[PDB]
């Protein structure tokens, strides 16, 4: 895919390849984060000892918002595949802007599920992948930086549902128009679900978990499957139906 | 290992485990960077189009130095296992400092091979792992951030030779004292080389390259072996002999 050549983007085979490559990215990052304890103090707002001068929020929030401000200055969020966790904080680039042709509907930047993602990550994913419960006082920064890597990968994968939805829309405008016009969510869901393909994904995930990071001479497959089945796939679909419901300007 | 409990640190079995875990980390990061072209413009100082207001250096340098300043404020370089690429730029922490007991010799922060590492990474490693030659104008930031991940992993692995050297020193002070006193480098090299173990490492690396990121239903083993054999292991040894030669205060 080349975000300056629209045809490489709305191409369904290029989309599968990118989704499959993100699958590995996400698995590698979960393995990196699994080496550390849960570190509850990292996600708690204004924790004594991890309190940042003139900042209201958690240790995780400071590290992530600061990273976004720096990257926004170098054009990160000008790209259609990048959605920010702190939309109010991002700056304008100090480098010549890349001219990205409009590929998605105009309101695309407004379809943003990062709050929900950050939330389920902390409340549901951390507890399954961490090595143990409790704070590891000497690894708060190691943890936060690994968390940022996991969040940015999940975010890109989940919001990639926008390109999936646009490809589908364009391939059958008459059908989608009627579904959108009558706001038939059940009809849309049924058209964006291929149960056969979803089983296949889960089966491949189980086999990757079995070999990845395992010394040939780290993460439970059951949990990897639970995460994709209960969190990743379902939220990707929410992004797709919301993108679609507003497709005829909204 | 717990950098607040010296015995967990100079323990040789805890050291193997940490080295083996970094082996996976490094392999995963090489795979992430392999998806992009060489991007020569990223490493060139003051490139037209990637020129940063009031900054002399490359795009890579700006991203990396800025990251270090932010992390230094949250105590990254207070930890003995973290060595900075920009020692002159790092700040003092605005959080209560962690009291790390002196585990390594005092001059330890001065043994820093990051310039050499950054250099061989650009000149020798990039060309072997990149997908193709040339600039990918729309992925300069994606590349730089992947480069930072690779550099920080290699840096931690290579400078980990300081702990290896201190463990050895402490286990046979009479022997090491004579080697150090007469500055016998050849004698030191011969005592820190177990050829049998080095073959074994290379063999395991070949088998990891064969399964990692390969869909069960990315990086050449030959190149992975060349990198560890010609760059990683040799520079780790340079860190160890330099740390040792200054051991009796220097
Ligand atoms: N492990 C140490 C040092 C550290 C490693 N990576 C970091 C990133 C940011 C801040 C600190 C760190 C800590 O968590 O404190
Ligand atoms: N791929 C785009 C956007 C991007 C992704 N990650 C980044 C990190 C920093 C800056 C930009 C980016 C680019 O390289 O420009």
Swiss-Prot record, chains A, B:
Activity control summary: Each dimer has two allosteric binding sites that can bind the regulatory effectors tryptophan or tyrosine. Can bind either one tryptophan or one tyrosine, two tryptophan or two tyrosine or one tryptophan and one tyrosine, which differentially affect the catalytic activity. Activated by tryptophan and subject to feedback inhibition by tyrosine. In the presence of both tryptophan and tyrosine, the enzyme is in the activated state.
Record pathway: Metabolic intermediate biosynthesis; prephenate biosynthesis; prephenate from chorismate: step 1/1
Keyword Cytoplasm (UniProt): yes
One term under GO cellular component: cytoplasm
Binding of L-tyrosine, residues: 75-76, 139, 141-142, 145
Domain of life: Eukaryota
Binding, L-tryptophan: 138-139, 141-142
Single GO MF descriptor: chorismate mutase activity
Any matching Pfam family: CM_2
Subcellular location field: Cytoplasm
GO BP terms: aromatic amino acid family biosynthetic process; chorismate metabolic process; L-phenylalanine biosynthetic process; tyrosine biosynthetic process
Domain Chorismate mutase: 3-249
EC number: 5.4.99.5
Induction: Not affected by altering tryptophan or tyrosine levels.
Catalytic activity: chorismate = prephenate
InterPro entries xref list: Chorismate_II_sf, Chorismate_mutase_AroQ_euk, CM_AroQ_sf_eucaryotic, CM_II_prokaryot
Major enzyme class: isomerase
Keyword entries, A-Z: Allosteric enzyme, Amino-acid biosynthesis, Aromatic amino acid biosynthesis, Cytoplasm, Isomerase, Phenylalanine biosynthesis, Tyrosine biosynthesis
pH-dependent activity: Optimum pH isin the absence of effectors. Optimum pH is 7 in the presence of tryptophan. Optimum pH is 5 in the presence of tyrosine.
Function: Catalyzes the Claisen rearrangement of chorismate to prephenate. Acts at the first branch point in the aromatic amino acid pathway where it steers biosynthesis towards phenylalanine and tyrosine, and away from tryptophan.
Subunit structure: Homodimer.
Annotated protein name in UniProt: Chorismate mutase
Native species: Saccharomyces cerevisiae (strain ATCC 204508 / S288c)
Lineage of the organism: Eukaryota, Fungi, Dikarya, Ascomycota, Saccharomycotina
